Design a protein around this ligand. Structure first.
Ligand SMILES: *[C@@H]1O[C@H](CO)[C@@H](O[C@@H]2O[C@H](CO)[C@@H](O)[C@H](O)[C@H]2NC(C)=O)[C@H](O)[C@H]1NC(C)=O
Ligand SMILES: *[C@@H]1O[C@H](CO)[C@@H](O[C@@H]2O[C@H](CO)[C@@H](O)[C@H](O)[C@H]2NC(C)=O)[C@H](O)[C@H]1NC(C)=O
Ligand SMILES: *[C@@H]1O[C@H](CO)[C@@H](O[C@@H]2O[C@H](CO)[C@@H](O)[C@H](O)[C@H]2NC(C)=O)[C@H](O)[C@H]1NC(C)=O
Ligand code: NAG
Ligand code: NAG
Ligand code: NAG
Lengths: 119, 211, 319, 14
């Protein structure tokens, strides 16, 4: 037994879905092809790729899925670009220009005030 | 950006959606039988006589009470989360809007300069104005300059050098200046500091003393 | 599975109740999602993964106990290995995997650490700007009201005290089993909740038997449904109790996670002046280390010593 | 009551 999760690109884009079987170690009681066996269960109906990308729909255990040029794919999420800093005991980098940037932050302050007449 | 992206205000929309779902779940529990012959009290009363009618009512009555207590508990927990957000928002307005904060990445990413609040349904939106360094260049450095055997440290800036000359500059924006006694200060000899370099510190009085 | 255990008769009675299963699943899902959010806010503070240089030329400052060990199958620091080694079903109760695995947490931690060692706090504001490590320290000393003369004249002293302190931490954590009690307590509380929930299945709740199959094999419908209907509310009560407690507990964890994220931004990717916020003493810098279900910070502070008494005055009268 | 050293004086005299 186990839970079954359905990975859905929005339906206003695509009607393809992929399905994850929580405790199946492929040994699956449904279908085959496009089978990616991972620690989060068997993901059937998605193409595993050797690329990495930013996470879109998270699955678990390092794996995210997305809809790309079309099919649903499974991939290891990337944690970001690499940056090797030229550290040296006699070298300093100093800015010569600047940018004034404005960003936004949104916070809730209040919720709807409700009341209930129990009778 | 706000006009273009519909997800931009998802944090406020989510609050609205959660509260709507709670109310739209509570009213649906009224359709439940909870083991009673009918979800409707009027049907129980029009068809059953008191020795049995009260028994059926007594199931619905605990069913409905359970739904209300569940609702209230969830609203209390959710309210606590909103309060925490409100406390943070108030803190930010005092520290980001009515001041200049030095807390890193608290009032936006980058060095904070100022911010402006804007209102929104059920919340507050802040526009955080920050300074972001750009276009850095690589320079050679040293902790001190050795002049006449005495060690000179910068008063505020950092000693840097291009291929032929040493300068002292402010750390966050390159602006090289002559290394002088008004830009540096002296402490200790040219021995204890590791990486001290051979250079000349300009004396601003000398030419006036001679003229 | 928790309430009916695949009994058909129970399921049909369960359907007469409200949408309680939906509510329970939504509450637990909301907690589960939040837990990945908390992990990301605490550790994913850097958009790039910074790498260290070959480990050399840090002015005598030895970071070997906090940097990842290249010889290991899992690239964790010696301290992280100690932290990890210190922290210790068929009723429909399952456990979901985290989105970020220990390896991904280790990569974020090493990125932040590489970042602060080679570029100080600049990587947290804009591009990382390389600086000699000892000059970074000079600025950190100015930041606590001490001139730069002190750091350079005593650079060897400072590097040796630093190196000693890190070594003491590694041994202290190894030696004292209570050192990570805060993370072990979380684990223990969650284990107890699950190990209490499964035991309520043995309760009769006034029914003739705790087992649905016994009720059904011995009693006929006019009575069998009555007995089932007691167990069914008993099991539902246990689940609602469980969920409410998990929601309250989750809120406490979220508050901790919010604090941890704040500390990383203010203690790790900067230099804070908040008293006793980033360790006791005057704050200079800090380094994160990962741990099961949490974060451990090593806070490096300046503590004044060996004071002497002097006579003072507010001003000098000259002419 | 103390003396505040003047750094220009000896240069002005030398
Ligand atoms: C380092 O910067 C100095 C100026 O701050 C450069 O020297 C000047 O170069 C101009 C020609 O471009 C001459 O007219 C000036 O008389 C020079 N000033 C001095 C004090 O010599 C110097 O060329 C730069 N070095 C390198 C390698 O780029
Ligand atoms: C940082 O400190 C460690 C101690 O934890 C040093 O490790 C020693 O390395 C040498 C050379 O490989 C070995 O012979 C010693 O046995 C190690 N010490 C211990 C206790 O095992 C390390 O060399 C230091 N690194 C720097 C750059 O100073
Ligand atoms: C602070 O006091 C210590 C004395 O404990 C000074 O020198 C250190 O002495 C201990 C004990 O003999 C040695 O193990 C250390 O190696 C010594 N330090 C150095 C750099 O050699 C220390 O110099 C005093 N602090 C300052 C700033 O002068
Ligand atoms: C410059 O370097 C020489 C060694 O070549 C050293 O003896 C001297 O003290 C240094 N500083 C000054 C100001 O001469
Ligand atoms: C930097 O490293 C080089 C190479 O080991 C050495 O020659 C130089 O003296 C060092 N400078 C400082 C300030 O440590
Ligand atoms: C020093 O003390 C005397 C009193 O003994 C006072 O009159 C004088 O103003 C003080 N300061 C100086 C600079 O003389």
């Amino acid at each position: 037994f186990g839970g079954v999760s359905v990975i859905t690109p929005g339906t206003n884009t695509s009607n393809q879905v992929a399905v994850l079987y929580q405790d199946v170690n492929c040994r699956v009681y449904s279908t085959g092809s496009n089978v990616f066996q991972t620690r989060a269960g068997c993901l059937i109906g998605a193409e595993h790729v050797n690329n990495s990308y930013e996470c879109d729909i998270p699955i678990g255990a390092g794996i995210c899925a997305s809809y790309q040029t079309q099919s649903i794919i499974a991939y290891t999420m990337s944690l970001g670009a690499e940056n090797s800093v030229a550290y040296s005991n006699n070298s300093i980098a100093i800015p010569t220009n600047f940018t004034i940037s404005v960003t936004t932050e949104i916070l809730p302050v209040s919720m709807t005030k409700t009341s209930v007449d129990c009778t | 950006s706000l006009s273009s992206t519909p997800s931009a205000l998802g944090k406020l929309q989510d609050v609205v959606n959660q509260n709507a779902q709670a109310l739209n779940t509570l009213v649906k529990q009224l359709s439940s039988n909870f083991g009673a012959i009918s979800s409707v009290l009027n049907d129980i009363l029009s068809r059953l006589c008191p020795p049995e009618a009260e028994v059926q009512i007594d199931r619905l009555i605990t069913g409905r009470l359970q739904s209300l207590q569940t609702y209230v508990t969830q609203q209390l927990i959710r309210a606590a989360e909103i309060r925490a957000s409100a406390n943070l928002a108030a803190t930010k307005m005092s520290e980001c809007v009515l001041g200049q904060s030095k807390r890193v990445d608290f009032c936006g990413k980058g060095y904070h300069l100022m911010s402006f609040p804007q209102s929104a349904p059920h919340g507050v939106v802040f526009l955080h104005v920050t300074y972001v360094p750009a276009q850095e260049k690589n320079f050679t450095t040293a902790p001190a300059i050795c002049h006449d055997g005495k060690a000179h440290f910068p008063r505020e800036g950092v000693f840097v050098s291009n291929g032929t000359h040493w300068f002292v500059t402010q750390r966050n924006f390159y602006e090289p200046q002559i290394i002088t006694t008004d830009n540096t200060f002296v402490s200790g000899n040219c021995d204890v500091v590791i990486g001290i370099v051979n250079n000349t510190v300009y004396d601003p009085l000398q030419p006036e003393l001679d003229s | 599975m928790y309430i009916c255990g695949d009994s058909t008769e129970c399921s049909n009675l369960l359907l007469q109740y409200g949408s309680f299963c939906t509510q329970l699943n939504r509450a637990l899902t909301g907690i589960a999602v939040e837990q990945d959010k908390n992990t990301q806010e605490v550790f994913a503070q850097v958009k790039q993964i910074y790498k260290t240089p070959p480990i050399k030329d840090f002015g005598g400052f030895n970071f070997s106990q906090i940097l990842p060990d290249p010889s290991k199958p899992s690239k964790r620091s010696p301290i992280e290995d100690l932290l990890f080694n210190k922290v210790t079903k068929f009723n429909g109760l399952t456990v979901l995997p985290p989105l970020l695995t220990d390896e991904m947490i280790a990569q974020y931690t090493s990125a932040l650490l590489a970042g602060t060692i080679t570029s100080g706090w600049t990587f947290g504001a804009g591009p990382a700007l390389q600086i000699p490590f000892p000059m970074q320290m000079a600025y950190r000393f100015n930041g606590i009201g001490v001139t730069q003369n002190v750091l350079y004249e005593n650079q060897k002293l400072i590097a040796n005290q630093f190196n000693s302190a890190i070594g003491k931490i590694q041994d202290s954590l190894s030696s004292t089993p209570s050192a990570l009690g805060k993370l072990q307590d979380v684990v223990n509380q969650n284990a107890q909740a699950l190990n209490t929930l499964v035991k309520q299945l043995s309760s009769n709740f006034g029914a003739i038997s705790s087992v649905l199959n016994d009720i059904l094999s011995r009693l006929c419908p006019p009575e069998a449904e009555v007995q089932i209907d007691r167990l069914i509310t008993g099991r539902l009560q246990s689940l609602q109790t469980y969920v409410t407690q998990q929601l309250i507990r989750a809120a406490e964890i979220r508050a901790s996670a919010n604090l941890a994220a704040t500390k990383m931004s203010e203690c790790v990717l900067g230099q804070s002046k908040r008293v006793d916020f980033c360790g006791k003493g005057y704050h200079l810098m800090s380094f994160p280390q990962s741990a099961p279900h949490g974060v451990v910070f090593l806070h490096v502070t300046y503590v004044p010593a060996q004071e002497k008494n002097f006579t003072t005055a507010p001003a000098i009268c000259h002419d």
